[PDB]
């Protein structure tokens, strides 16, 4: 009786939200951006190839100086690369080799990683002893660690396969905030440029926008037909793009609270592993299972170019903070640095 | 055209690669086993005989180092992280023979043995395990023999039309799992009958892994 009545009210609320979104859908992003000229063909060459990982690479993250990056592989090694020279700055042996994510702190003093061990380990890069040591192991998730992002040297947000995201206090080792509401494994998260909000994509084919300070879900974005594997904020923080197993990328707007554009091609039938934006946001770079990375025109939904330089699944990619280069990591155990030429 | 500190940084990088190569060679001389199975299938008993989210067990047997990974605690979606184990030497799948007349506690309608077969079919025929051998353990041999005297195998498999004895019912169950092998050319299934007091399980794994090591050597050398 009471349960039946309540679940009927949820359907009414869902219809109310759907009608509200349809009311403000006066135009389409495609119609708005019809007049603008296309970006043309985007040609990027492999400037650097980072060799040394001996297993599949699952994650990489640029440092804020746009020169150092950290990559994680399931050979149990965290490696910090000097992308300009391809020199290895550090090689961090991981206690658990089943790492799925890695993050570089914006200060450059810390890196984080974690995988099937359900632990987010924080590593101190600046020690008087001259070696990288574990400073914290963040326990509390009951599923595998899928993504992590630093807010500062003391705060980090992690997403897990236990359907929850958590905000951690690194100094005390306790999760100050727990973000619940996903019904599937959360696979990725992206921080807003001001680090006051973050979006997460889960295996329930939905993307939720979370308030870091308040700790509740502000908006929920649906439209994908399969698990969301990747998510990335637009450079202004007012939009984000997702990548799913249905071979599509979608651009959602926070303020319009609905999907604006879909990035798919008929030839593409494989899942998407990673997504990122260029510095201006005009380019959306997505990594795919078909061993390639496709550069999309974000505004016009045109495939601007292809990065085809890997012999296995492109598992991760990232664009530098200055926008100078994009790195792609792959299951073939190599990282490559790409940029165009005049 | 390198400065005095740039040359030292390149020398430091070569020191890192000299250790990454050293660690990679040592990692290639070790055996990695993905331990799978269902609840109350004797999986924990196998670990006790071979002494967070994932549990890794190290043991050395006859100058060979084994790393056995247990993922029984990972209650999340398997398809999201099952690809992390693509490349393990072998998969140890444990099936409880006595769990043929029993039923699932939650489902209350699916046979316990039929539950294992579906899991075995989805793992053996998984796209990440096309050429990965499987070491099949059939635990609770003694308990199955006691139950087969009172409870016939016809309850679990209606099509069974053989003698209601251990020597035939157990062999019939073995053929049922081996029949689920959808690729009988790229991989082989090593079936063993363990027990609660058996001590040859580790020897069987060493022999089964040794054949898997030989097969991989033949492929790399070009003979296979």
């Amino acid at each position, epitope marked *: 009786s009471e349960l039946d009545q309540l679940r009927q009210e949820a359907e009414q609320l869902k219809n109310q939200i759907r009608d509200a979104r349809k009311a403000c859908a006066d135009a389409t992003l495609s119609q708005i951006t019809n007049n603008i000229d296309p970006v043309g063909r985007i040609q990027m060459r492999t400037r650097r190839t980072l060799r040394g990982h001996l297993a599949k690479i699952y994650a990489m993250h640029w440092g804020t100086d746009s020169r150092l990056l950290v990559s994680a592989s399931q050979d149990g090694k965290l490696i910090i690369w000097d992308s300009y020279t391809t020199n290895k700055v*550090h090689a961090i042996p991981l206690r658990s080799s089943w790492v799925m994510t890695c993050a570089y702190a914006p200060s450059g003093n810390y890196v984080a990683c974690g995988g099937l061990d359900n632990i987010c380990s924080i590593y101190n890069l*600046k020690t008087r002893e*001259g070696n990288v040591r574990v400073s914290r192991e963040l326990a509390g998730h009951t599923g595998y660690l899928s993504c992590c992002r630093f807010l500062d040297d003391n705060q980090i947000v992690t997403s897990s396969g236990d359907t929850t995201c958590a905000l951690w206090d690194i100094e005390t080792g306790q999760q100050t905030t727990t973000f619940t509401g996903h019904t599937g494994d959360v696979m990725s998260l992206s921080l807003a440029p001001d680090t006051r909000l973050f979006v997460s994509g889960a295996c329930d084919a939905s993307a939720k926008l979370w308030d870091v300070r308040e700790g509740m879900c502000r908006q929920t974005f649906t439209g994908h037909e399969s698990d969301i594997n990747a998510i990335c904020f637009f450079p202004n923080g007012n939009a984000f793009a997702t990548g799913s197993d249905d071979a599509t990328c979608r651009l959602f707007d926070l303020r319009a609270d609905q999907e604006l554009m879909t990035y798919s091609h008929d030839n593409i039938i494989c899942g998407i592993t990673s997504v990122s934006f260029s510095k201006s946001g005009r380019l959306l770079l997505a990594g795919y299972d078909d061993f390639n990375c496709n550069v999309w025109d974000a505004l016009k939904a045109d495939r601007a170019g292809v990065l085809a330089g890997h012999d296995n699944r492109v598992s991760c990619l990232g664009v530098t903070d200055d926008g100078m280069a994009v790195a792609t990591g792959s299951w073939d155990s190599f990282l490559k640095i790409w940029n165009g030429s005049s | 055209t390198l*400065s*005095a*500190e740039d040359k*030292a940084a390149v*020398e430091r990088s070569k020191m890192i690669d000299r250790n990454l190569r050293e660690d990679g060679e040592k990692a290639a001389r070790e055996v990695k086993l993905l331990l799978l199975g269902a609840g109350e299938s004797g999986k924990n008993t196998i670990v006790k005989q071979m002494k967070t989210g994932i549990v890794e067990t190290h043991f050395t047997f006859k100058d060979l180092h084994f790393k056995m990974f247990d993922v029984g605690a990972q209650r999340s979606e398997r398809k999201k992280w099952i690809h992390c184990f693509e490349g393990v030497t072998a998969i140890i799948f444990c099936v409880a023979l006595s769990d043929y007349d029993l039923v699932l506690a939650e489902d209350e309608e699916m046979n316990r043995m039929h539950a294992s077969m579906k899991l075995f079919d989805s793992i053996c025929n998984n796209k990440w395990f096309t050429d990965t051998s499987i070491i099949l353990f059939l635990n609770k041999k003694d308990l199955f023999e006691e139950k087969i005297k009172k409870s016939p195998l016809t309850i679990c498999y209606p099509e069974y039309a053989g003698s209601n004895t251990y020597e035939e019912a157990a062999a019939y169950i073995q053929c049922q799992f081996e029949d689920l092998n959808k690729r009988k050319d790229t991989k082989e299934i090593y079936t063993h009958f363990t027990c609660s007091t058996d001590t040859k399980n580790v020897q069987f794994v060493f022999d089964a892994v040794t054949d898997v090591i030989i097969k991989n050597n033949l492929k790399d050398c070009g003979l296979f």
Partner: single-chain antibody, 231 residues
């Protein structure tokens, strides 16, 4: 804590041989390159030898090459300096210096206490030998180099050291602008090309000492004469 203790020094006859040891504790010894730097009595710092991490690269000063041998024992965390044919010119305090080299590292960050031995090229110029100073007042120290220390990679390999009276040198500024860990922010390094300035805002009693500028553009590493601050 990070420690570098030197031993084996003492009075030796000319033409003799002596073995210097540097025991390291509190840091990853095998990860650091090691230098020997000596200081003649009432004189400035002089670089002696260098052995890299992994012992693959070894450099010597021309004045000691062929007579001194530098070696390390990574398992024992000991740095060695085998000296032969010792001359009266070798009478100095020998310092053990650790230095690690990667992008953004701070070489020459820690120095040993030193051991005293008594026997019976880019030019770095610090023309101002002494500067009278008062606490709370801003002081600038100038250094010059015969060659441009700015490399094509954008780094300017100039280092600043402070040797307080009775103490070992301490790193203040590495690569001409970066502030070393544990150094107050009042110290600032500014330079261009061959001319460099070390600015000390709000001078204090601890800042009293001798300041040395060193170049790390190429070997042999050379030191300036040194600028002494006195009250």
């Amino acid at each position: 804590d990070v420690q570098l203790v030197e031993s084996g020094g003492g009075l030796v006859q000319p033409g003799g041989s002596r073995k210097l040891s540097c025991s390291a504790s509190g840091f990853a010894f095998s990860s650091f390159g090691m230098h020997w730097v000596r200081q003649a009595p009432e004189k400035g710092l002089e670089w002696v030898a260098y052995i890299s991490s992994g012992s693959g690269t070894i450099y010597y000063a021309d004045t000691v090459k062929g007579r001194f041998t530098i070696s390390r024992d990574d398992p024992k965390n000991t740095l060695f300096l085998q000296m032969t044919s010792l001359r009266s010119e070798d009478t100095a305090m020998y310092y053990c210096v650790r230095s690690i080299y990667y992008y953004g590292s701070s070489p020459f960050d820690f120095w040993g206490q030193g051991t005293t031995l008594t026997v019976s090229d880019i030019v770095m110029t610090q023309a101002t030998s002494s500067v009278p100073v008062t606490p709370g007042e801003s002081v600038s120290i100038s250094c010059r180099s015969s060659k441009s220390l700015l490399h094509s990679n954008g780094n300017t390999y100039l280092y600043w050291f402070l040797q307080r009276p009775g103490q070992s040198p301490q790193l203040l500024i590495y690569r001409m602008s970066n502030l070393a860990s544990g150094v107050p922010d009042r110290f600032s390094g500014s330079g261009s090309g061959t001319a460099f300035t070390l600015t000390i805002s709000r001078l204090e009693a601890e800042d009293v000492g001798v300041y040395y500028c060193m170049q790390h553009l190429e070997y042999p590493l050379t030191f300036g004469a040194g600028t002494k601050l006195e009250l």
